[PDB]
Paper text:
TRXo1 and TRXo2 share high levels of sequence identity and similarity (74% and 97%, respectively) and their crystal structures are quite similar and overlay well (RMSD of 0.9 Å).
TRXo1 crystallized in the orthorhombic space group P212121 whereas TRXo2 crystallized in the hexagonal system and belonged to space group P65. Well-diffracting crystals of TRXo1 and TRXo2 were obtained with one molecule per asymmetric unit (a.s.u) with Matthews’s coefficient (Vm) values of 2.3 Å3 Da−l and 2.0 Å3 Da−l corresponding to solvent contents of 46% and 40%, respectively. Their structures were determined by molecular replacement at high resolution of 1.80 and 1.50 Å, respectively. The distances between Cys37 and Cys40 Sγ atoms are 2.03 and 2.05 Å in TRXo1 and TRXo2, respectively. The region containing Trp36-Phe42 residues including the WCGPC signature in TRXo1 has a different conformation to that in TRXo2 and is shifted by approximately 1.9 Å. On another note, the fully refined TRXo1 structure contains 130 water molecules whereas the TRXo2 structure includes 92 water molecules, of which 51 have equivalent positions in TRXo1. Even though TRXo1 was crystallized at pH 7.5 whereas TRXo2 was crystallized at pH 5.6, which may explain differences in the solvation shell, TRXo2 would be more positively charged than TRXo1 in a pH range between 5 and 10. With a pH value of 8.1 ± 0.2 for the mitochondrial matrix of A. thaliana, the global charge of TRXo1 and TRXo2 in vivo should be quite different with values of −1 and +2, respectively.
Residue numbers in the entry: 3 to 113
Write the structure that this text describes.
Amino acid sequence: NGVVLVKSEEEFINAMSKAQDGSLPSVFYFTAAWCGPCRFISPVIVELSKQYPDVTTYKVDIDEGGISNTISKLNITAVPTLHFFKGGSKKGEVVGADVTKLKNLMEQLYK
């Protein structure tokens, strides 16, 4: 129920099970060591996890082997990318650095 690093296929499958079938409030944060804007978004996501403590944000490094195919099977076109889930279905897909949309969605969905 905070920021959770996802490094393996198993961990991602479990996280998506919680977000979809499990209907738990879940955000997927796709990042990379080479992502410039993620350098100031990652801290923002940490502070937001304290504001919305029941949400789980799964932080995904797209360069990670093991989840190598999950990424290509997700059509990730840019880092950062954020996927928002509530009630078991996707409520948002913020592609690129847009913290306004991130904050608007966190409040609208998980307040």
